[PDB]
């Protein structure tokens, strides 16, 4: 592809940084308006205490040793279920 | 600067061979003892 | 079963087995010319007082280097690759036998009609019964109908071990939550002993392996007499 | 913000034979002593851990 | 759109950077960065060998393409010559930094 | 006296230090797994700082206030730098190849499918489609600044290096926030494996790869580049591509493709 | 009183190769018939005589006889 | 002027290949080591059932 | 059809030594029909032909631990 | 190669010496170890 | 490349120069000794008469040395060899190595 | 004459039946009556003495071919060294049966291997070529 | 001074012979273990005890003798005290990094020993296979510690490989092309470019062994999954270009040895053999499962790996017969350095071949975990790689110390050693071809008249070993200094004179382009 631009004339800073505020930059406030419209909780499924997740072959070197390092109540059960 | 030649461009001294002997054995001697005594180790923990 | 001082494979049970013995006898011979052109070649090389030590021409000869070798691996991988696909050609089997791999023995399971399964251990060297075989015999053997084709299918219940039976030419890795295929046929009644093949903790050495190869007839009964 | 390259140029360049990790001045030496410290005895630490693990608690 | 700010080497370069890049603006190669070319090499047009004592070793590519480099130290004084193809040398000893 | 133009490097303690921070780190880490404690490793992080500081601090003496670097030397920090990145492409490949590998051939303990059963992958759409832009945007503004430092003009190669930091801290905020808010972890079988693994390694790579914007970020504020001579500051930008092509890979890959 | 003939002078070195090379392929024929007939076709030989009249169960009833199964007495 | 090897040479060939062949052929035959030999054409086969 | 079973017959879907997916996919079929025949008051009876296949091909200690994951409601294939 | 003769020469009496001194540095420990195996063992 | 003949004549002019200094004495004989051959009696006589021209006895002597090596085991080459060059031996005043005792190990 | 470890840059001497005419002579300081022996020399060679020759030669080389090619008698030390060595390698193998080596397992005592012996017959353990290949059941003992 | 000289080392000399004296320490280490193998085997029954102790001293002989003696020495030891005095560089490129990949290999070698003395030890095996080497078959540190050391030692060889590869394309003489190298220079950039490549993906799959053991990933767990079979791919990714690594400064060493040797000015072939070795590199990355024809791979794969496999003896070949063309016409001098290259040449000939019988995956099935791999492996280690590093040693020990060793001892430290690694190995074929296994601390009573015969080996190799410590000592006892070298006209590393000084190529040499 040519990407669908034009451009080219010689090279510099001034179309780099042309390319950051007309281009990138709002790529990136797109996606961060797009993000934001999709946010907030989702409805946390059934917990099922299959034997292929909350894998437990030695506890975890911190906590209580059954918690993961970004151990979330809200959305990871522990191998017996949800937390209270 | 650093003394150049020959005996004097290694971290040992060669100045007298029977200190050489004796470091020479300390050396290779330890590395060749080593697994016999975890070995040993071993067999006298279970 | 190996037997002292023995040099080479051991006699071939099966028609698999028997093609690699002429196709080992066949790689060796060409093994031991090459080995044997090196040496002279090293001593023709260091035998003389004549000298020649200017810059030599490398190409003409490096033709013959490349091409003669080339020609060699050839006629080694054509019978290694017959054989190869000749192993993995279908079969129709009669029977279906599973062997799991476990620290330390090996169980088996043939339930293809009744839920027959049994554990197999080495038979520890103060319990043999003289002419037994130190490390090599077990308690229940696996026993088999000679003269047929039979599936065998390995796995594990813990760590990797390897089911082998050198005289078939039998080695299929047991390993857990994978089950491995590979053919049994036995051209003779008889004992067929192997070892565990991938190293599986302190027993690794004392989980052997024994076919008992018998008329079909007397596997069914063998069968019936084991449920 | 001033360019005072010039003078860490200057500084550097001192014929004072001082090795580069060193010829800033007593801080260099000051931190050149806690890592050394640090790691020396980090070591030390290391080989009675192993000592330590090397023998049954049970 | 545009300003400066930034130094240039010609402005902030020091030590041996900035030896090599004031020598190369005047042509010369103190510092050995270049290959030298060859002179016919004879008795009389030596491939002339700078050095900053009393020898250098000289390693002889006798001719184009060869894979093996003869090496010889080359001495102050009368001119040598390569120990395989005979192309003469000769040491121009001293100095360097002006 | 020397008549090359190699750098001749004084005696230092910092491969030393180096070595014994190493060993403090996997006997530390040793330790934390299986004698539930930290101090050894704390130590061996500590060192391991101090090592890289202190080197890395006399690479600049060497260089921007000794003048050793010339081209010949600059031309080795090339090739030692381009090096370096080869390894570390190797190395993220044995993770893509441990993805892949489960992925394709998905055993039953999985239920035989990709995604396992009872796995709900994030939606590759939103946050993970921002993180993309955000490095993307990153590889934009990194080459605004490289061009305004050949060009000479400090201010901005200052701005488009401060964007460019704040991309990679942004994604680097972002990634927590969803590493926190994911429903699977890294006990969920092969999936969880993967995913955080991969990712982890790279958000790794994101954090050092913006420590070094940063380290650039500064020597700039104190005039160390010229126009011409910037070389920290090139390394730094190749390593930020290697990042951001990394992410495309696990983006395509992992979100996308493993989703 | 009486002169010696000129020598061959030159390529003694190369005509020792030529020659020692021909031999060394001359002994390697030799011993791949001597290979094949010693080894290999003495194994294909002693293979199919071995089963030429074969009889499986024969061969099981000597076994069974001898005590060796468990599963046949 | 003759070296060690036109001095010793001879004897330190003679005692070394002398002492070899002794030490060896002692530990092979008269130490109780188990070498193990086949049994073919030399053990005579007995009743084990 | 097939009565004189004597074991599992080739099967050009799993042609290669890993007969894993063989075993499990005998055994997700046995019990898929059995679930379509038990509800649909039809005889599980025609399932009879992955049962045989499943029950030769299938390690003892794998069936028995489907069975208990079926049974307890963490299954992870689809029946 | 050509050299010097020896600054110090090593008499063939010293050799037997830092031979035999050398062979006990790897014999005596290894075969203490060996020799206290069942020690060790049925311990 | 050259026949026999023009490897030879090549050798001796080589020798013959009249100006053939020490180096190129040296270079020359250094250099034919790494080819596969004994030298022809032709070159040998050009080599032994430079030896002459350079004042220089003892390199005449060696070169008559390595003739005899580069036979290897071929005892035939020397003697004839020698024998080719006997009037350039006498007229130079040249004693074989045998005549010296520089044949004794 | 003398050879200094501080002149390894210089060319050097050496006796190489490959490299006939070295890069100097042997012997570069000449005594009174060597520097009127090498003015003999630039007159007819026929007028030298063979001790003049044999000490011109001596100047220019230090050793003859047949010298630097001699055979020494090193291959006797040599062999003889490493069979002695290997000869003290069997003392530690008896110390290690003695003294390390306990009681092999019991299924090497002789009845126990005839009665084993046997069984493998029983059972034609390599019965092609190996094993029972080589025992004739007819006659009932090994094959001759 | 002495800290400053031997801790803070930036000198590239000095370096080379740090690692020369830390693999050798090694290698005693090494041979230890290998004697307690042979002795285990030696009689049937049980020695130490059960497979777990008798496996630990197997896996940690594997470790030492190729990570930390090896490796060390021909790469870290030769590579930097030749590297760059055969190119006429005043260093490495980079000489304070190339300290630390020294610095990290005492950590490493402790982390293995570590290993050995926490719990049981590691008795896995060098592959370090899972589960036998997870967290339930090796509960605790143990296999955590050998992991971390291949960490060290990983780490230690990548900035090596990046130092050698770059120091080697950008500090050779301007006028010196690539094809002006010498081909012990070109072993080593072919042998960085391996290591740079198969490292990282050997860290990749130890590190997710790690992880499954301590942070409950289950990259190799069926149970969450993954694949032990996995585990098998990336380590022999990494393990097959290793053994080439393991030969390639060999063949290096070996090129300059028989040159040398022969009394010529060049190898014979220079062009033939860069395309071999590079030729070698490139097939050693395409093979890695001919180590693994036994798991139940398609058969396709199988006639792939074979075939991929077998290429390699094409190139290879075009070596071995270019070391005997150098010989041809050679002024041969029977140095103890070439009677080590001879015996390389012949015996890594067997070696490889052996390898060649292996790469067809029909005849592996009966060979794999078998005696005959550990025959083929020890023909190319013990007597390829091993002469390889005594030739280069004996060759250069004048020139690293300004000493000369006896050469009448070497040469009988030759004959012993040659005696006993034949009579160690030769005999495990037939014991490979009976099918005796792998990693059994005992054996069927069949197979003990070749073990016996194997152990006595063994044991001769040990004197060997003894007498070279020995013979070292005699040569720094004795302080005969080097005068004269020849053929330095060929063999630039001799030019600085023995041992050259401190600071070399201060003046870089002067070639002309023309
Ligand atoms: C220095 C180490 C080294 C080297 C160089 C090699 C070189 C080769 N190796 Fe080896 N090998 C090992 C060390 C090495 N090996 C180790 C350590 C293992 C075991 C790993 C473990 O499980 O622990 C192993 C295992 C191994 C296996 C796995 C076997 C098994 O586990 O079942 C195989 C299979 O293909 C193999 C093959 C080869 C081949 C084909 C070569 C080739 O590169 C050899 C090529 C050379 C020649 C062929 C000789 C010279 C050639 C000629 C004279 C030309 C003419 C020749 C012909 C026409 C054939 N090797
Ligand atoms: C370089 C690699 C290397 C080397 C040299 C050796 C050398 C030896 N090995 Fe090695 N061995 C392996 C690599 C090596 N081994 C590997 C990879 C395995 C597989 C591990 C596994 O299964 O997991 C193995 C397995 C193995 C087994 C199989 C164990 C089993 O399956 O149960 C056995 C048994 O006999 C054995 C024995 C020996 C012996 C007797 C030697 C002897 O030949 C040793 C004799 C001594 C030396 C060769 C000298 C040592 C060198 C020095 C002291 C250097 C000095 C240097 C300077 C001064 C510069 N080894
Ligand atoms: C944007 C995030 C950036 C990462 C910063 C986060 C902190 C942890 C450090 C991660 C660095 C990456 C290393 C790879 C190791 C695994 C961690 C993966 C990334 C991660 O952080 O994974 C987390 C788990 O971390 C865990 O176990 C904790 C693990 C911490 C222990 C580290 C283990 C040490 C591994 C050493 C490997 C050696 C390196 C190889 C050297 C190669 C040399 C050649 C995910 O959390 P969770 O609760 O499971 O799920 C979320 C549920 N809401
Ligand atoms: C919890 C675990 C701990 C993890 C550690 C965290 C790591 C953070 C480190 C971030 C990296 C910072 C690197 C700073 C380097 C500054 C020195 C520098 O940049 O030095 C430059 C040379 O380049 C050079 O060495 C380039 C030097 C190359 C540096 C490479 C950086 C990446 C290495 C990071 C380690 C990777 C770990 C991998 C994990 C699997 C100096 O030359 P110039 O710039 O031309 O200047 C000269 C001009 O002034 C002349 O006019
Ligand atoms: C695999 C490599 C090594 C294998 C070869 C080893 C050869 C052995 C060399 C001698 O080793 C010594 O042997 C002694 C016995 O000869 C031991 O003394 C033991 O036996 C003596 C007599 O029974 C007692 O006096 C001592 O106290 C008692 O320690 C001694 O401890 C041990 O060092
Ligand atoms: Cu089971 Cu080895
Ligand atoms: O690996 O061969
Ligand atoms: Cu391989
Ligand atoms: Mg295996
Ligand atoms: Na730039
Ligand atoms: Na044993
Ligand atoms: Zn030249």
Known sequence: ASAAKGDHGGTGARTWRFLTFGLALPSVALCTLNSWLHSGHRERPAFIPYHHLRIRTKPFSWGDGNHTFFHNPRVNPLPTGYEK | HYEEGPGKNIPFSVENKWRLLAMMTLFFGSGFAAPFFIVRHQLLKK | ?227 | FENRVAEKQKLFQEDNGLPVHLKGGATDNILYRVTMTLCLGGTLYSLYCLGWASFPHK | ASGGGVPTDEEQATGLEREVMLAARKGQDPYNILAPKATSGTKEDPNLVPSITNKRIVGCICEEDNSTVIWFWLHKGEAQRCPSCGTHYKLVPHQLAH | HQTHAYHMVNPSPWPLTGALSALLMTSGLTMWFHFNSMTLLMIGLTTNMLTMYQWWRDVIRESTFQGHHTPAVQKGLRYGMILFIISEVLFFTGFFWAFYHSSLAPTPELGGCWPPTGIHPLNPLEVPLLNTSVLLASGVSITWAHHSLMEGDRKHMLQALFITITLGVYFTLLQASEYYEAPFTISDGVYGSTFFVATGFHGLHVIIGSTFLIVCFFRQLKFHFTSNHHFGFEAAAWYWHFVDVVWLFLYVSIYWWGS | STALAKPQMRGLLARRLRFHIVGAFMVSLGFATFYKFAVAEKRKKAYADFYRNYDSMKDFEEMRKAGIFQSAK | APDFHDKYGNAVLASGATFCVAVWVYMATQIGIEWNPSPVGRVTPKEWR | KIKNYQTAPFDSRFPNQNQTRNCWQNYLDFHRCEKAMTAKGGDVSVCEWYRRVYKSLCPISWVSTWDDRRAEGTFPGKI | ITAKPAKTPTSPKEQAIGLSVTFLSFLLPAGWVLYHLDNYKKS | HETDEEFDARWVTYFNKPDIDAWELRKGMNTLVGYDLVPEPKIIDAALRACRRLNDFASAVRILEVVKDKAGPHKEIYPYVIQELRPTLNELGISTPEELGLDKV | SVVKSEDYALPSYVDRRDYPLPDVAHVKNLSASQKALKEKEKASWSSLSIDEKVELYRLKFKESFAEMNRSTNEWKTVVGAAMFFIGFTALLLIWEKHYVYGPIPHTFEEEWVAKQTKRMLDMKVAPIQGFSAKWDYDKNEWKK | MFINRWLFSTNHKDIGTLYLLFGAWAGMVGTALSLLIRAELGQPGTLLGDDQIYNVVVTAHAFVMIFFMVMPIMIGGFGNWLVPLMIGAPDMAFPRMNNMSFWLLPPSFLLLLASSMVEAGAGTGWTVYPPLAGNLAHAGASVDLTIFSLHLAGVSSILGAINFITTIINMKPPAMSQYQTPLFVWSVMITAVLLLLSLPVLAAGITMLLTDRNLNTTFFDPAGGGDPILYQHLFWFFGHPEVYILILPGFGMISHIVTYYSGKKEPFGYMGMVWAMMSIGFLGFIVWAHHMFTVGMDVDTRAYFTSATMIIAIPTGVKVFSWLATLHGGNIKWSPAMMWALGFIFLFTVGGLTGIVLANSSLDIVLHDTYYVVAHFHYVLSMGAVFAIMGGFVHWFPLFSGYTLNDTWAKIHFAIMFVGVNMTFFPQHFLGLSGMPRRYSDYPDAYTMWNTISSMGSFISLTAVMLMVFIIWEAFASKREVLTVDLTTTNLEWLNGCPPPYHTFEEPTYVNLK
Not at chain 3, 11 to 29: G, Q, R, V
Not at chain 3, 67 to 90: F, H, Q, V, W
């Open chain 3, 1 to 227: 079963m190996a037997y002292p001082m023995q040099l080479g494979f051991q006699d071939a049970t099966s028609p698999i087995m028997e093609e690699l013995l002429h196709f080992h006898d066949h790689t060796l011979m060409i093994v031991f010319l090459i080995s044997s052109l090196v040496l002279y070649i090293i001593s023709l090389m260091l035998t003389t007082k004549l000298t020649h030590t200017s810059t030599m021409d490398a190409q003409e000869v490096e033709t013959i280097w490349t091409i003669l070798p080339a020609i060699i691996l050839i006629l080694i991988a054509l019978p290694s690759l017959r054989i190869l696909y000749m192993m993995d050609e279908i079969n129709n089997p009669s029977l279906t036998v599973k062997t799991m791999g476990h620290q330390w023995y090996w169980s088996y399971e043939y339930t293809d009609y009744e839920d027959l399964s049994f554990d197999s251990y080495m038979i520890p060297t103060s319990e043999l019964k003289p002419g037994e075989l130190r490390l090599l015999e077990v308690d229940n053997r696996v026993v088999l109908p000679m003269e047929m084709t039979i599936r065998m299918l390995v796995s594990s219940e813990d760590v990797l071990h390897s089911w082998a039976v050198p005289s078939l030419g039998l080695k299929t890795d047991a390993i857990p939550g994978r089950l491995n295929q590979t053919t049994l046929m036995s051209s003779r009644p008889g004992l067929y002993y192997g070892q565990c093949s991938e190293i599986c903790g302190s027993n690794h050495s004392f989980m052997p392996i024994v076919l008992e190869l018998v008329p079909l007839k007397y596997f069914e009964k063998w069968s019936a007499s084991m449920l």
